[PDB]
Design a protein around this nucleic acid. Structure first.
Lengths: 228, 129, 146, 96, 197, 69, 47, 144
RNA sequence: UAAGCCCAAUUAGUGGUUGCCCAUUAUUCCUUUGGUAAGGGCGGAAACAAACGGAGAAAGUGUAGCCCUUCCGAUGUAGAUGUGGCCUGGAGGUUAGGACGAAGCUUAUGGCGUGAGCCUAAGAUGGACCGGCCUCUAGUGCAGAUCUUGGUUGGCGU
RNA sequence: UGCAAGGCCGGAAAGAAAAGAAUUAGAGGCACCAAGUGGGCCUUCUUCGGUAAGCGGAGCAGGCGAUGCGGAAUGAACCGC
RNA sequence: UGAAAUGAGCGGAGUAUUUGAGCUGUGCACGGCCGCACGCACUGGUUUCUUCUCCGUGAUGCUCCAUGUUGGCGAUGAAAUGGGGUGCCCCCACCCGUCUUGAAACACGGACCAAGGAGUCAAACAGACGCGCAAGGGAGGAGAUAUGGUUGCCAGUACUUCUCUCGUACUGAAAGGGAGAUGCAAUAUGCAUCUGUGGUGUGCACACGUCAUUUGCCCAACACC
């Protein structure tokens, strides 16, 4: 009936197939990416184990190397914060109590983290935390809005890079550092977490004391998984 | 003419806002005024002082301005004003004005009962036939 | 030549037909279908318009504007009565010939007038049925004139 | 005090593990009025007509560390005239 | 509370609406607010940006400014393809200082009576914004111009007069009044005529 | 009454509230009026001859265009 | 923790969950331990 | 329109925007221009340099009439010519006479490629204004 | 046999791994309001009388917001500004009301708005004026000045 | 045809590798008009006069002033926020 | 309460490849070329254990609203929800305005009410914003008639000029002087031409390209001349 209705409702007709074809075609990649990575991870921890176990029994040792990513969360509130510890907590995107970020661990970021330590409980993430934090608390920053990740399509949208497609590419550069670690995090909205379920018992002291703040190494995972 | 139903009618706060310390003084009207007192407790929010009006008390904007009957109230001074709300009568209802008469008030009650538009202060006996 | 676009900026906030009461904006225009105050519903203002308006028993008139006799008023508004039992899509399809914008409302209003007339018929019957019992001490009749 | 959630010490329930058994049960507060008002089976079973009344609730979760269990009286709160008086914890809804 | 120093200092003022009571301007923005939205063209949403600016920010260009400018573009265009339109969202005025203007098809909100005759008498057109939507709905092959805003006597008074290296016109009704100290070098001192920054 | 107080207290908090604006770029203001003059003269004596040569190129690119087409 | 998302973000999750449930069965888990303990110790005694 | 005034938004503020500590009062600084050399010195030496002192020789009884020279530019001789005179003009041909003392101007300055050649009747002329007309095919016939 | 001091733990060499209570905090859900706000729809798709699935859809800063989905913020003295923001006496318009009862007045008279306020109900009040809306206009909003004037009042049958 | 300067015309441009080898709720920049304030006080650390002071005077910062709310029975400023 | 149930979950039909077990070959890794390899990387062998796999519905719905089951009460006087009043209980809670670093203060004003009660009017200047006109803009005072009329509505509206005034030009104490571009060219007023940005760097939109960006012109504007 409507002259342009067909010139419309036929265009909608093939844009629907374009969606469905460009959807189920993404699972194939999202599937063969995850596969590639899961096998990639067991091919590492099982390499260290064989490699560690050789340095033992011959009287050698094995360096764990140096962790690269570090999860950082802010244990104090906003009050009575000095000028240089504002400007650092802002450049780390931690603007709020119990925000969290993933950052490289290198000399400029190491020396930057120790000036704010009274504010910061940080450490070295598991793979279980990154998955949990990129899935459950993951929010992409799209056009200025903080939007939850309900889908693998929107990730491929924001990042046109096509080394980041599914949520399992997200976790990868987060976990393994790598090339796109910045442009993946920098597009994540900084994590917002609940308080720890059972608690620290003294936010005001360093962890190596009856304290929270500072570098608690891998015990951050155990501490962080209470926030999620 | 059963009204257009909305979602839940919940009000944020029913109790009114009255100005600080009007009960003590008989000339002070219960109407609100914002205290500008520098050491005034109410301005400083002391927990157990009266609460102030905010942007935060809005009425939900879905159920906003709806009387308990389900009808947004439109005033009517004469039998010709019934015709505007003939079509939307599921939404609006009429309110005869105060000064409108025992004689005009006879007319509007008829020509409302015929059209099925609803009057609030219109005689309700024709409805409870 | 004074387009509707330009005239709606003039009459929007002031009018005879505006009638904003208690924060509500209705319209007392006789040519409004549902009575909201908007361009599509301003009959006096638009260059082509239509209305679903009642007549005797259940007949449904339709008044209709048009571009051409736009000035010259007894000639710019033309009414045509549809028969008593008219379908509502019949009346709407008339209005949709002139102004397809109104195809929905004229339908809902066509069915509406049909509801009113058959509502007046039940009421005016029940009022007089029980008006017999009342003994009135006065009544008035305007005497036929030649 | 936040007057939404009551606190109930139910007799012979002395530990927390003993409270989680009661999550969901329906508490009652059986006070009385002065004049006799309307009642649930009124005029069906007129022998219930009387001055006594009840407020009902549910047990929302264990409060404390020993046998102490919070309560929600549905849509309202209990009077503060009920404090230190008899609350009734029934055995239903049964989870068994 | 979340920490956002400010947050009142990245925010800036925009004002989508118009401060003009003119009923016709309110039609022109009606057109471009529509067709700067759906048009996918740079030109067409600049004129919507510009159409809401209050008179002070829309400065009339004289004629002979359009002519000189458009004679600079007309040299390097291909001789085959010529269709520039002077499109101005301000007023266009008449320059007594220049005669013999070519035919430019200028578009504007308002023309000086002597400026419009001085166009058509030399063979050009004058076409207002309800036309140009028909001729250049994409703004294609238009030429967009602004005004000259920096010669106003208000911009001349801005800044303090007695600051070193500030040439600025002070507020006085009697010009012979303030010449005599801090201006003349002879008595107290002369404000330095130039200052490095 | 002792009115002679002096403090720096709140200042660098105010000075950074609109921030300390960084310097103006080198290219923005040169304006060499200082300046060592016999070099300044010999700079304008060239800067004139660069105008002729550059305004001539304006003409040679008028012909060469209309020459092309 | 929601079954419907996690698969949309990681379609491979089910293989991963099935591989993990392949450990938790008691028959396979200790027969896993029997072989590891023999595999490793024999490797030690080779150096 | 007193309903738009700032006073009408300030009912209830009690201080009308003049401040709680330093109050509004009457005259804080002295009345008017008072304080030029003293406690306003920064203002009058910043925004108004030159307000103080004496300058120049002294002219009693200044009557503005004997000194009257509105001038004009060669660039601006168009608007003293009606249309159809400016249409027909050429160097050596017949060209319209423009009178100044009847047109409210006196001196004829420089500043322009004279647009329309003319013979201009002017009380006062300048050097470079002379050349251009004389060169562009007009003339200057001076009057009084 | 601490309900004291030092140290330490979490239901205790029994399997590691969060005892419990309380914030205007954190996380999340609903509702409001403001954006440097982000995006979508707005060419009426078609069909369709009563009687015995309805109703809207405005090219738009602001309203009872054109509709919808989304995201972030939200406290504040002095101070600045905004409001299609409330009230008052009048003038230009427009639309109404009123001896079947106007202004005024009184009320455990309710209804609407975050609020200024509006509106209806009743008067066993009143006795002749008056409301809405656009615009104009000003002697235009009271609790405090040892404020002005009139009245009254506890102290006191002292 | 060295050096100074203004250009012009070509060259290349991990657009900044590797080495721990940056990060950002990073729109930069300019302008007009104008209010209030110009009595402050408290604290970690540094600090001068004084026997000392809930005394007087400063430095870098954070607060109260202007702001409550949860906590130290109570307290402007402490603790958490 | 299905008024678009997008579901491993709902429907349809079928029996899939992730891990763990043993091992392949080159490689890595370990020990002092061989031996090792705890089983890493590459091809990717075994099926003994382990697990479900696959494909299906756009809106022709732009918006809002409208669809269960079981009992109690509700049969025109009542029932029910909301609002209101008075008392009570548990809890929370210093007296207002003000000067003040600091007020609940043993700091000052304060018995109650009604009616009054405080940023106004005028002029000069400026900057925002609305309007007209634009190298021109605008009067002021007065005159002229419809009106030489009308109780009034009219003290208004309509009409008008040479002039006046703020502008188009500025500078010097003053006498005085007084502004374009290009080419040729160096003449103590050089000469010619007149469709034109004085030049350079940065710079909307547009135009022809390219994988945001090359070049053209660059409006406004900033800077150097």
């Amino acid at each position: 009936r409507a002259a342009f209705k067909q010139q419309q409702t036929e265009n909608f007709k093939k844009a629907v197939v374009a969606r469905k074809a460009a959807k189920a075609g993404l699972k194939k990649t999202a599937y063969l990416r995850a596969r590639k990575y899961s096998r990639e991870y067991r091919g590492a921890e099982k390499k260290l184990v064989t490699l560690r176990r050789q340095a033992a029994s011959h009287g050698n040792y094995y360096l764990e190397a140096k962790p690269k990513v570090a999860v950082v969360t802010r244990i104090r509130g906003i009050a009575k914060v000095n000028p240089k510890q504002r400007k650092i907590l802002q450049l780390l995107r931690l603007r709020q109590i119990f925000n969290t970020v993933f950052v490289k661990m290198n000399k400029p970021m190491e020396n930057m983290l120790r000036a704010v330590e009274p504010y910061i409980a940080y450490g070295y993430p598991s793979l279980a935390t990154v998955r949990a934090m990129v899935y459950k608390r993951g929010y992409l920053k799209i056009n200025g809005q903080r939007v939850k990740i309900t889908d693998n399509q929107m990730i491929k949208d924001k990042y046109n890079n096509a080394d980041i497609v599914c949520a399992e590419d997200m976790v990868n550069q987060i976990y393994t550092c790598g090339k796109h670690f910045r442009t993946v995090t920098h597009g994540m909205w900084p994590f917002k977490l609940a308080p720890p379920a059972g608690g620290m018992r003294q936010k005001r002291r360093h962890f190596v004391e009856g304290g929270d703040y500072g570098n608690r190494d891998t015990l951050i995972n155990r501490f962080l998984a209470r926030m999620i | 003419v059963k009204p257009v139903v909305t979602k839940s009618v919940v009000k944020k706060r029913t109790k009114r806002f009255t100005r600080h310390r009007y009960e003590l003084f008989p000339q002070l009207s219960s109407s609100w005024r914002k205290p500008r007192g520098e050491d005034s407790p109410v301005r400083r929010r002391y927990k157990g002082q009266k609460a102030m009006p905010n942007k935060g008390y809005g009425s939900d904007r879905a159920t906003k301005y709806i009387t308990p009957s389900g009808f947004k109230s439109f005033p009517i001074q004469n039998v010709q004003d019934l015709y505007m709300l003939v079509m939307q009568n599921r939404k609006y209802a009429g309110v005869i004005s105060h000064t409108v008469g025992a004689r005009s008030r006879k007319a509007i009650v008829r020509k409302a009962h015929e059209l099925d538009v609803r009057l609030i202060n219109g005689g309700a006996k024709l409805r409870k036939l | 030549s004074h387009s509707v676009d330009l005239q709606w900026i003039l009459v929007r906030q002031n009018s005879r037909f505006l009638q904003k009461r208690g924060g509500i904006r209705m319209s007392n225009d006789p040519f409004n279908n549902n009575g909201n105050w908007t361009k599509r519903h301003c009959g006096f203002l638009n260059e082509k318009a239509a209305v679903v308006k009642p007549a005797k028993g259940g007949a449904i008139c339709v008044t209709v504007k048009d571009g051409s006799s736009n000035n010259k008023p007894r000639q710019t508004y033309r009414k045509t009565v549809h028969a008593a039992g008219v379908r509502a899509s019949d009346v709407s399809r008339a209005v949709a010939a002139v102004r397809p914008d109104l195809a929905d409302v004229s339908f809902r209003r066509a069915r509406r007038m049909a509801c009113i007339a058959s509502r007046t018929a039940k009421v005016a019957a029940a009022r007089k049925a029980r008006s017999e019992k009342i003994k009135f001490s006065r009544k008035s009749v305007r005497a036929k004139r030649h | 005090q936040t007057k939404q959630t009551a606190l109930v010490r139910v007799e012979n329930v002395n530990t927390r593990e003993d409270a989680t058994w009661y999550v969901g049960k329906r508490v009652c507060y059986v006070y009385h009025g002065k004049k006799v008002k309307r009642c649930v089976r009124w005029s069906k079973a007129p022998a219930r007509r009387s001055t006594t009344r009840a407020l009902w609730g549910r047990v929302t979760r264990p409060h404390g560390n020993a046998g102490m269990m919070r309560v929600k009286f549905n849509g309202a709160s209990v009077p503060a005239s009920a404090i230190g008086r008899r609350i009734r914890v029934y055995l239903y809804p049964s989870q068994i | 509370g979340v920490d956002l120093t400010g947050i009142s200092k990245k925010s800036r003022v925009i004002r989508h609406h118009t401060y003009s009571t003119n009923p016709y301007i309110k039609l022109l923005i009606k057109l471009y607010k529509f067709l700067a939205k759906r048009t996918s063209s740079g030109f067409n949403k600049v004129v919507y940006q510009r159409l809401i600016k209050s008179r002070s920010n829309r400065a009339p260009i004289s004629l002979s400014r359009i002519a000189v400018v458009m004679k600079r573009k007309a040299v390097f265009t291909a001789k085959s393809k010529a269709a520039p339109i002077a499109v101005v969202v301000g007023d266009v005025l008449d320059d007594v200082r220049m005669a013999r203007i070519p035919a430019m098809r200028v578009c504007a909100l308002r023309f000086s009576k002597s400026a419009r005759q001085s166009i058509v008498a030399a063979g050009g057109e004058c076409l207002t914004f309800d036309q140009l939507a028909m001729i250049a709905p994409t703004g294609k092959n238009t030429y967009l111009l602004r005004g000259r805003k920096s010669g106003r006597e208000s911009v001349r008074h801005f800044g303090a007069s007695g600051v070193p290296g500030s040439h600025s016109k002070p507020y006085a009704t009697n010009r012979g009044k303030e010449t005599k100290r801090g201006r003349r070098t002879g008595r107290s001192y002369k404000r330095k005529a130039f200052r490095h920054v | 009454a002792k009115s002679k107080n002096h403090t720096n207290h709140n200042q660098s908090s105010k000075n950074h509230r609109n921030g300390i604006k960084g310097p103006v770029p080198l290219h923005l203001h040169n304006s060499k009026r200082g300046s060592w003059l016999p070099a300044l003269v010999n700079a304008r004596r060239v800067r004139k001859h660069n105008q002729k040569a550059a305004l001539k190129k304006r003409r040679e690119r008028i012909a060469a265009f209309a020459a092309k087409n | 923790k929601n079954r419907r998302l996690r698969l949309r973000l990681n379609p491979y999750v089910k293989r991963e969950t099935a591989a993990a449930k392949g450990m938790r069965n008691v028959a396979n888990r200790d027969a896993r331990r029997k072989a590891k303990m023999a595999r490793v110790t024999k490797a030690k005694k080779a150096a | 329109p007193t309903r738009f005034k700032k006073c009408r938004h300030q009912r209830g503020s009690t201080f009308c925007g003049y401040g709680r500590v330093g109050k509004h009062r009457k005259h804080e600084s002295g009345r008017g221009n008072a304080g030029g050399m003293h406690h306003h010195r920064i203002n009058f030496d910043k925004y108004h340099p030159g307000y103080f002192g004496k300058l120049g020789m002294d002219h009693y009884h200044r009557k503005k009439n004997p000194m009257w020279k509105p001038t004009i530019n060669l660039n601006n001789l168009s608007r003293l010519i009606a249309a159809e005179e400016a249409a027909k003009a050429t160097k050596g041909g017949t060209l319209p006479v423009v009178d100044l003392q009847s047109s409210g101007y006196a001196k004829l300055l420089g500043n322009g490629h004279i647009q329309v050649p003319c013979i201009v009747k002017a009380r006062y002329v300048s050097k470079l204004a002379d050349k251009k007309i004389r060169k562009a095919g007009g003339a200057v016939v001076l009057q009084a």
